């Protein structure tokens, strides 16, 4: 029933971050204070085993016997910024956590009964079926979003529960409310260790242990109220009607006056009657399958896709109105000398528009990076199942739609080659171009935190790629030390496939038959002359050569994105 | 020597924002507290006369006689987020404030002596010549950036000094430091009125008056320590080791409550004597502002090594790439396609690289509002100075270096006028696109919406350029849209300059007559096939269309700045 998290002689380098630090965390409600420059948040990441174990130079023991390998699984860590998803209910978030974290042996009834128990302990009955939500669609208050995030780690019943600053970002009455909630939760035999940033007296009066940290040195460790009892014996009387936490942070900033400060306070405490008995206390001392994770990550990602009416509907609206505009400008393509220019221009516009609208695949792996790191090291899934699920539920149904609706709108308004295979090869080429551009987007933007640099990098890359398309330059006139760059051009393969599909068997000189022979050359009367003038093969291997080049680019870029996710700094 | 800012019966609508509010601000160190939902920041904006005077329904009096017209000139307002410019020193910021705010009669010696007096009062000798700076280039700490911003309004010697939350965003020891600085500054006979957000006891123990505000109602007004003396008499027993400011903000929420506390304040022994106290009751020229705004903007331009050097680097490497792909334009049937493609790429690249003129009038909007209503300059001088020192030297360079790189690598028409008309056309296209950028992005706060609006506008504009569509084949109910197209005028001028007098059929002379038409052998046939006039009025027709677009878009941007909500 008890859970003592002892720790002894913890030094750390990445910069000596944490100096000589000792301490015992009884099963009460423990607290870590200090300024932000000190190791207040670094000690919590060391004790929760989510900092990388190279620089750790001490033993963290749990009830005697040392810390196990999978310690992060039987534990909790409430991150400071909430990584709960807004476009879901509370009960669906708890179902996701219970389905990916509990065993596979219990069925829906017991898991629902546990979720009902957790949602009935924290008091979330009024919002048990409402969306969590941000200020983009109707959602709950920020005082219960935090306890929703707290309830996501109480499903596995941890005896030790870590929290990173559960008051930063909240208003006052809600902060007092969840502090009283944690105070009530602590007395069931659960160790609660948390950092906090400048608490008030109504929060400080309910602690059970205190750990002051400034510049990586230990200023105090003991009971919480004995800190006020102890700092008067060092020659620092606390003024009446003054907050003791503000008193400690003031006397540690040097602003308070007694009535190299950090080292001096460190060993004015090291030789006190609080260090010795703590030293005596120290001296007597996967879960699921691949298919299950794939199904659940894909289900949650698809619910988030249809629960966000920004990136799902507005893309379809702008695609439909752009198709109506393009079908209205190029209405009735004729076979004059201006029939070549209109066809080349509209096919260039399609293959450029696909690559430039596929630039918005940045925000697949950047706006949820912290959620991915947290749920990977918490032991939910593996990297390949997350990658396959996020891919299969976000890239496919939103890149396979605009090519279909775009071709179906513009193909009969323009009046292109009236066959069936000429329709379906055009649709397939637009699909492959969109998939190749989104694959390059994922290969560039994976493992990033800032969104802008990948968008600007892809912007200059796609400006360099569309010169080699075959419209602005003739690809048979570039010098041979430079013409090899055209094989790194997705719009070149798309434009070449569309031009080979469209221009074969056309006559563009009205009144003149130039198939048997061309009288008076420099005439460009046929479509085959236009294709050979651009450097395009006339055999049926040119079209599918472009298609297999696009498929190889898809496979290579997706493999690079997966290896960039797998080799991420996940700590 | 004293400066009492009295105020009496102040109601306000934009929503009744401020209810029945009375108060006296003695020349000490006054404080306004309360939650953020209350009128803590709204009363400070009402008393500082930088909220618009429609909804104000009471009299704010200064030493008796009412508030004058130019009250914001003989005053100070330290905004909460610092609008000081990082790419300048402290002494240059104080020189800018002293040159645009003091009189023109005093010369450099007395103004420098005043700046030395201010910089020697606030303790800025160690950073008097260092750049203020952000985390983009070496700069000073955030504890003296705030007092640098405080010193920018102490040049005109105000007797009343307003501050909007001088502790939000700072660390603790620095916040205590500038609070002790304001405490020392108050005892020279200077009224200091400020809002603050959740102070500690070491800050609360040095106040002189208090004004609690919750939901627009007055909860308390009097001396600061009598608030804890007063709240026990209402039946709120004060706990020891508790901060009194946290005690007031806690008993406002929980230890019709607001109305009830309002009229137990209203019938107390603090409301009556305050009611008795209430019942016994440009600077420069246009050329000077133009010179100083242009000088500060040019120093900020050369002090930021992002938008000045990297543009030139990407322009030089893009010119080297374009000169390497199109090396040696010949006169075959593929000589028309290469020329049309490279000229389309130049006129598209100018309009799309001129999209980054968003951040001229969006990333300094709050500084513009603050220094306009503080009485520095007028709108036309700011507009002309910012224009003349940011748009001209950074849009007139890439056309010159781009033409000088690509014109002889490509091998275009080897004359001098064909070189200079190309350079002039690229200049006019860049200026027209930046003018449309300023006309869209003026008076905005968010940066992204103007960039996306210009992006869809320039995608719609480059279809009408003359390359993707033949402009003589569009239906007549739709072809009138081509006159709203900057790349059409640029591309038409470049094509008329380039293609005249060229032969593209090798071995065939097609100037006297064209044997076997559908041949496109000459450049005049290519120009007439696109719809371009062959007279010398087509080129300069495109140029005067670009000049008219420049003038119209700059006038629209100036009228959008002048009609801004400047309050």
């Amino acid at each position, epitope marked *: 029933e008890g859970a003592v998290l002892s720790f002894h002689n913890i030094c750390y380098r990445v910069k000596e971050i944490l100096s000589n630090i000792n301490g015992i965390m009884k099963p009460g409600l423990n607290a870590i204070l200090g300024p932000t420059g000190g190791g207040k948040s670094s000690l919590l990441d060391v004790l929760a085993a989510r900092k990388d174990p190279s620089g750790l130079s001490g033993d963290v023991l749990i009830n005697g016997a040392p810390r196990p390998a999978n310690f992060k699984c039987n534990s909790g860590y409430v991150v400071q910024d909430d990584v709960v998803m807004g476009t879901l209910t509370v009960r669906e978030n708890l179902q996701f956590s219970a389905a990916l974290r509990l065993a596979t042996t219990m069925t829906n009834h017991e898991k629902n009964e546990r979720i009902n128990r957790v949602i009935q302990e924290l008091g979330l009955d009024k919002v048990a079926d409402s969306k969590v939500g941000t200020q983009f669609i109707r959602g709950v208050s920020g005082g219960e979003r935090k306890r929703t995030s707290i309830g996501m780690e109480l499903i596995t019943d941890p005896s030790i529960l870590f929290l990173d600053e559960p008051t930063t970002g909240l208003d006052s009455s809600t902060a007092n409310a969840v502090l009283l909630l944690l105070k009530r939760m602590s007395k069931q035999g659960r160790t609660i260790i948390f950092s906090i940033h400048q608490p008030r007296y109504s929060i400080f009066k309910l602690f059970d242990s205190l750990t002051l940290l400034a510049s990586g040195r230990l200023m105090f460790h003991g009971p919480a109220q004995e800190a006020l009892g102890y700092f008067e014996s060092a020659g620092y009387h606390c003024e009446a009607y003054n907050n003791p936490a503000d008193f400690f942070l003031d006397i540690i900033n040097g602003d308070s006056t007694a009535v190299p400060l950090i080292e001096k306070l460190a060993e004015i405490y090291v030789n006190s009657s609080f260090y010795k008995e703590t030293k005596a206390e120290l001296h007597q001392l996967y879960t699921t399958s691949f298919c299950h994770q794939l199904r659940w990550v894909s289900k949650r990602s698809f619910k988030n896709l249809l629960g966000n009416p920004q990136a799902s509907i507005a893309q379809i609206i702008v695609t439909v109105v752009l198709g109506l505009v393009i079908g209205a400008i190029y209405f009735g393509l004729k076979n004059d000398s201006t029939g070549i220019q209109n066809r080349a221009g509209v096919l260039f516009f399609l293959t450029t528009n696909q690559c430039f609208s596929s630039v918005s695949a940045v925000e697949l792996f950047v706006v949820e990076k912290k959620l991915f790191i947290h749920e990977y090291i918490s032991g939910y899934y593996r990297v390949s199942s997350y990658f396959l699920g996020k891919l299969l539920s976000d890239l496919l149904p939103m890149r396979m739609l605009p090519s279909i609706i775009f071709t179906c709108i513009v193909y009969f308004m323009l009046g292109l080659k009236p066959k069936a295979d000429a329709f379906f090869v055009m649709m397939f080429t637009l699909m492959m171009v969109a998939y190749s551009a989104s694959s390059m987007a994922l290969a560039i933007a994976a493992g990033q935190s800032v969104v802008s640099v990948a968008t600007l990098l892809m912007t200059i890359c796609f400006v360099f790629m569309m010169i080699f398309s075959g419209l602005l330059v003739n690809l048979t006139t570039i010098a041979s030390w430079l013409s090899w760059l055209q094989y790194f051009s997705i719009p070149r393969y798309g434009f070449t496939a569309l031009q080979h599909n469209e221009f074969l068997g056309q006559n563009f000189c009205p009144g003149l038959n130039a198939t048997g022979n*061309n009288p*008076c050359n420099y005439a460009t009367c046929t479509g085959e002359e236009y294709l050979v003038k651009q450097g395009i093969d006339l055999s049926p291997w040119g079209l599918w050569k472009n298609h297999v080049a696009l498929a190889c680019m898809i496979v290579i870029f997706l493999t690079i994105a997966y290896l960039k996710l797998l080799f991420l700094k996940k700590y | 020597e004293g400066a009492v800012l009295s105020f009496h019966n102040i109601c306000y609508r934009v929503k009744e924002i401020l209810s029945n509010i009375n108060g006296i601000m003695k020349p000490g160190l006054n404080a306004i507290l309360g939650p953020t939902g209350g009128g803590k920041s709204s009363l400070l904006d009402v008393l500082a006369a930088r909220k618009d005077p429609s909804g104000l329904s009471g009299d704010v009096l200064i030493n008796g006689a009412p508030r004058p017209a130019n009250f914001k000139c003989n005053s100070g307002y330290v905004v909460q987020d610092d609008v000081v410019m990082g790419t300048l020193t402290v002494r240059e910021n104080l020189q800018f404030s002293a040159a645009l705010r003091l009189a023109t009669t005093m010369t450099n010696h007395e103004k420098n002596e005043r700046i030395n007096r201010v910089i020697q009062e606030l303790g800025l000798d160690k950073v008097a010549d260092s750049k203020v700076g952000t985390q983009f280039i070496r700069g000073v700490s955030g504890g003296e950036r705030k007092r640098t911003s405080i010193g920018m309004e102490l040049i005109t010697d105000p007797s009343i000094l307003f501050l909007d939350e001088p502790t939000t965003g700072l660390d603790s020891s620095t916040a205590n430091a500038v609070l002790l600085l304001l405490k020392r500054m108050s005892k020279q006979g200077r009224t200091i009125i400020f809002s603050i957000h959740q102070p500690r006891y070491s800050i609360f123990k040095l106040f002189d008056s208090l004004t609690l505000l919750a939901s627009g109602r007055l909860m308390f007004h009097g001396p600061a320590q009598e608030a804890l003396g007063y709240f026990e008499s209402a039946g709120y027993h004060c706990e020891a080791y508790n901060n009194p400011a946290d005690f007031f903000l806690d008993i406002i929420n929980g230890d019709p409550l607001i109305e009830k506390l309002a009229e137990i304040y209203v019938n107390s022994s603090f409301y009556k004597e305050t009611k008795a106290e209430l019942h016994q009751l440009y600077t420069t020229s246009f050329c000077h502002q133009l010179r100083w705004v242009s000088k500060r903007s040019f120093k900020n331009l050369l002090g930021n090594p992002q938008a000045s050097i990297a543009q030139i680097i990407v322009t030089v490497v893009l010119g080297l790439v374009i000169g390497a792909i199109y090396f040696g334009l010949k006169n075959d049937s593929t000589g028309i396609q290469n020329r049309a493609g490279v000229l389309f790429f130049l006129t598209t690249n100018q309009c799309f690289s001129s999209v980054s003129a968003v951040e001229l009038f969006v990333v300094e909007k709050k500084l513009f509002i603050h220094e306009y209503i503080s009485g520095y300059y007028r709108v036309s001088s700011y507009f002309l100075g910012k224009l003349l020192s940011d748009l001209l030297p950074m849009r007139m360079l890439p056309s010159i270096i781009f033409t000088c790189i690509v014109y002889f690598m490509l091998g275009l028409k080897p004359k001098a006028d064909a070189f200079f008309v190309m350079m002039f056309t690229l200049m006019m296209v860049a200026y027209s696109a930046s003018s449309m950028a300023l006309a869209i992005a003026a008076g905005q706060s968010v940066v992204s919406v103007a960039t996306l609006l210009m992006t869809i506008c320039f995608v719609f504009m480059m279809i009408f350029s003359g390359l993707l569509v033949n402009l003589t084949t569009i239906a007549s109910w739709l072809s009138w849209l081509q006159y709203f197209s900057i790349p059409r005028y640029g591309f038409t001028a470049l094509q008329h300059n380039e293609f005249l007098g060229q032969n593209f059929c090798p071995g*065939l*002379n097609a100037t006297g007559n064209n*044997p076997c038409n559908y041949a496109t052998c000459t450049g005049e046939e290519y120009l007439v096939k696109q719809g371009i006039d062959l007279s010398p009025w087509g080129l300069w027709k495109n140029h005067v269309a670009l000049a008219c677009m420049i003038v119209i878009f700059l006038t629209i941007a100036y009228l959008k700045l002048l009609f801004l909500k400047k309050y």
Partner: antibody, heavy 118, light 107 residues
Framework: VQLQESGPGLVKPSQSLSLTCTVT?????????WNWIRQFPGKKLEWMGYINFDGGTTYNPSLRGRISITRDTSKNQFFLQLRSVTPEDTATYYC????????????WGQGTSVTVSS | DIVLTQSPSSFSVSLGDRVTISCKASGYILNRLAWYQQKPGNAPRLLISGATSLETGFPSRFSGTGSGKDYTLSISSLQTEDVGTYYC?????????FGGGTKLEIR
């Protein structure tokens, strides 16, 4: 229409080459393109390069800077200047015309032989 | 560039019969092919332009067919003046290339 080649037929190696084709019956500024074709022993033709009616030239890429073709409009002549003469090109040099509307080499010269040796 | 391959480097024909000379291109020419005839001691003489169009000054026993990369010159019932070398030239891409030459000899 009528073309004749003339010039030296015995040149030293790594020295120079200078031919001259004199057109009669047509003005070389007017309508055609005027080119040079050489034929090796063990007959195998090769096209060297032309000069247009307006003055532009285009050469074979297998003659990298060695060939230069000029003209003399006041007397209806165009010249061939082949520098750094290897003992490989012991060919027979023809001057021809090229219409471009038709596309083929219509009229030819009768041909002179250049025997480079020592 | 575009190399032109004449695989029958030498024929062996008698009077009266029909002979076909074949030319083969590397890339696509699109009927931009010409046929020449070089008697010994003379200059080459144009025979067929545009790969099918026999020009004036020649009897109508010569004919050209073919499309794409395959081309052929046919001399049906060859007479006694048809001893000579026959070349094929492309004029599609500007470095114009000639064939290897096909030498006809009489028996």
């Amino acid at each position: 229409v009528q073309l004749q080649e003339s010039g030296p037929g015995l040149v030293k190696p790594s020295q120079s080459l200078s031919l001259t084709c004199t057109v009669t019956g047509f003005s070389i500024t007017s309508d055609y393109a005027w080119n040079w074709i050489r034929q090796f022993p063990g007959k195998k033709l090769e096209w060297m390069g032309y000069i247009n009616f307006d003055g532009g030239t285009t050469y074979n890429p297998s003659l990298r800077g060695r060939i230069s073709i000029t003209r003399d409009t006041s007397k209806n002549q165009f010249f061939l200047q082949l520098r750094s003469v290897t003992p490989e090109d012991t060919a027979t040099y023809y001057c021809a015309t090229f219409y471009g509307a038709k596309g083929t080499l219509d009229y030819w010269g009768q041909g002179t032989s250049v025997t480079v040796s020592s | 560039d575009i190399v032109l391959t004449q695989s029958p480097s030498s024929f062996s024909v008698s009077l009266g019969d029909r002979v076909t000379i074949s030319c083969k291109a590397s890339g696509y020419i699109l009927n931009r092919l010409a046929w020449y005839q070089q008697k010994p001691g003379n200059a080459p003489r144009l025979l067929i332009s545009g790969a099918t169009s026999l020009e004036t000054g020649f009897p109508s026993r010569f004919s050209g067919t073919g499309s794409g990369k395959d081309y052929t010159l046919s001399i049906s019932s060859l007479q006694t003046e048809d001893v000579g070398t026959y070349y094929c030239q492309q004029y599609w891409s500007t470095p114009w290339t000639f064939g290897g030459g096909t030498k006809l000899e009489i028996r």
